[PDB]
Design an enzyme around this catalytic site. Structure first.
Site, short mmCIF file in Angstrom:
data_model
loop_
_atom_site.label_atom_id
_atom_site.label_comp_id
_atom_site.label_asym_id
_atom_site.label_seq_id
_atom_site.Cartn_x
_atom_site.Cartn_y
_atom_site.Cartn_z
CB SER A 279 3.34 -0.67 2.76
OG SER A 279 3.71 -0.65 1.40
N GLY A 280 6.26 1.37 3.42
CA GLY A 280 7.71 1.34 3.61
C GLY A 280 8.50 0.78 2.44
CD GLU B 25 8.94 2.11 -4.85
OE1 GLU B 25 9.91 2.68 -5.42
OE2 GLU B 25 8.26 2.67 -3.96
NE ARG B 26 2.18 0.32 -5.30
CZ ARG B 26 2.10 1.49 -4.67
NH1 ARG B 26 2.62 2.58 -5.20
NH2 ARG B 26 1.51 1.57 -3.48
CG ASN C 97 -2.17 0.78 1.05
OD1 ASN C 97 -2.22 1.74 0.26
ND2 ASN C 97 -3.21 0.40 1.78
CB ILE C 98 0.12 4.90 -0.53
CG1 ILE C 98 -0.44 4.70 -1.94
CG2 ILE C 98 0.92 6.21 -0.41
CD1 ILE C 98 -1.60 5.63 -2.31
CD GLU D 171 4.98 3.64 -7.59
OE1 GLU D 171 5.20 4.64 -6.88
OE2 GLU D 171 3.94 2.96 -7.45
C1 LIG Z 1 1.50 2.42 -9.51
C2 LIG Z 1 0.47 3.51 -9.39
C3 LIG Z 1 0.65 4.60 -8.53
N1 LIG Z 1 -0.30 5.53 -8.44
C4 LIG Z 1 -0.16 6.72 -7.56
C5 LIG Z 1 -0.29 6.51 -6.05
C6 LIG Z 1 0.79 7.41 -5.45
N2 LIG Z 1 0.26 8.60 -4.84
N3 LIG Z 1 0.69 9.35 -3.95
N4 LIG Z 1 1.07 10.01 -3.16
C7 LIG Z 1 1.64 7.94 -6.58
C8 LIG Z 1 3.08 7.51 -6.35
O1 LIG Z 1 3.06 6.12 -5.98
O2 LIG Z 1 1.11 7.37 -7.78
C9 LIG Z 1 -1.46 5.43 -9.26
O3 LIG Z 1 -2.35 6.31 -9.19
N5 LIG Z 1 -1.66 4.41 -10.11
C10 LIG Z 1 -0.76 3.43 -10.22
O4 LIG Z 1 -0.95 2.49 -11.03
#
Ligand SMILES: Cc1cn([C@H]2C[C@H](N=[N+]=[N-])[C@@H](CO)O2)c(=O)[nH]c1=O
Ligand SMILES: Cc1cn([C@H]2C[C@H](N=[N+]=[N-])[C@@H](CO)O2)c(=O)[nH]c1=O
Lengths: 184, 186
Positions: free
Chosen positions: A20-21, A93-94, A17-18, A41
């Site tokens: 989560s470290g 990352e992601r 999650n956003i 990311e």
């Molecule tokens: C990987 C991904 C991140 N994000 C967003 C969530 C995060 N928001 N903040 N702060 C931002 C950086 O992760 O991008 C998104 O909207 N769609 C996606 O597919």
């Protein structure tokens, strides 16, 4: 026959999650720069598409910009996923998977993505699996609680939604091995 | 290493303005169904994306729907471009190329596609050339004059200015520099 097939080393996907470290976790590996391929990311790319800041625009007016934003996120993920490297291990990352199953799916639920937009992305996701090789050998799930994630300013309800989606995808198809960590 | 590499026969792309006679031209080949792979422009797909009519929505509100529409067009184009076939010759009505160089480019010029949107599509176009094989051996350009095209359609309704814009774009791409074959469709 799929693009980038046979070009990738063992690949590890840091999901969570956003807050989560994830950034902290990926940094531990930085002393191994030389032997590990480390891709954070691609937020920087999202912040600057030949000058346009797609991230801000999306926050500003989701109904209009969520589609191009998520379409572009998808692309950047592929760019990372298919990037070549001579290293024997690669950590991201992601991934394309979190983008699809968590962020896009959530935007459908809260109607940021209208039916036609969601479907266009989905059709692309399906074509991407036929055509492009996404190397994924191990997911590391930095599992947290929405509230803890909250402490480290996105609304809490959003973090709960995203939490349930990560929970659905990673705990409850993809026969890729998952590794749950308590990041609380 | 690119998807669909080595899987495609000699491929012919029928290009032309709206109302340049493209459907009529492709039909001439229909009696050779058995030996030629014939793919019309995937309008039917655009009209029904799991129920959603993207074509309509685009016409009604271009500022909102042009991006997802062109994104989807691109996809359908790839689907046709990469579709397998055992035939020794393959002909497509339009292509990923017309959609990029003419339709998308035009929507940028008239501001249907705002900068951010246009750029997302362009980035995808670039990634697509790195990753996906687009077989294209011969373009057949059904060259016409915007006026004749306007006519041919009115009789069969796009504004004339649009057809001129599109005409210049086809002209730029195909004439003012894959082998191209110009036909007078007037
Ligand atoms: C990987 C991904 C991140 N994000 C967003 C969530 C995060 N928001 N903040 N702060 C931002 C950086 O992760 O991008 C998104 O909207 N769609 C996606 O597919
Ligand atoms: C190939 C293509 C067609 N179109 C439109 C133009 C045509 N409009 N009318 N009538 C319609 C069918 O060709 O689709 C588009 O907007 N973008 C594209 O990339």
């Amino acid at each position: 026959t799929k693009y980038a097939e046979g070009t990738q080393p063992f690949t590890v996907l840091i999901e969570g999650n956003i807050g989560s470290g994830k950034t902290t976790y990926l940094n531990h590996f930085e002393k191994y720069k030389n032997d590990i391929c480390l891709l954070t990311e691609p937020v920087e790319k999202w912040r600057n598409v030949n000058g346009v800041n797609l991230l801000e625009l999306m926050y500003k007016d989701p109904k209009k910009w969520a589609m191009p934003f998520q379409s572009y996120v998808t692309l950047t993920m592929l760019q990372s996923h298919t990037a070549p490297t001579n290293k024997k291990l690669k950590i991201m990352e992601r991934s394309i998977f979190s983008a699809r199953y968590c962020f896009v799916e959530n935007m459908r639920r809260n109607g940021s993505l209208e039916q036609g937009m969601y479907n266009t992305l989905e059709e692309w996701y399906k074509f991407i699996e036929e055509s492009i090789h996404v190397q994924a050998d191990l997911i590391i799930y930095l599992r947290t609680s929405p509230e803890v994630a909250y402490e480290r300013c996105v609304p809490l309800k959003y973090l709960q939604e995203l939490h349930e989606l990560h929970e659905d995808w990673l705990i409850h198809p993809q026969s890729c091995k998952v590794l749950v960590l308590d990041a609380d």
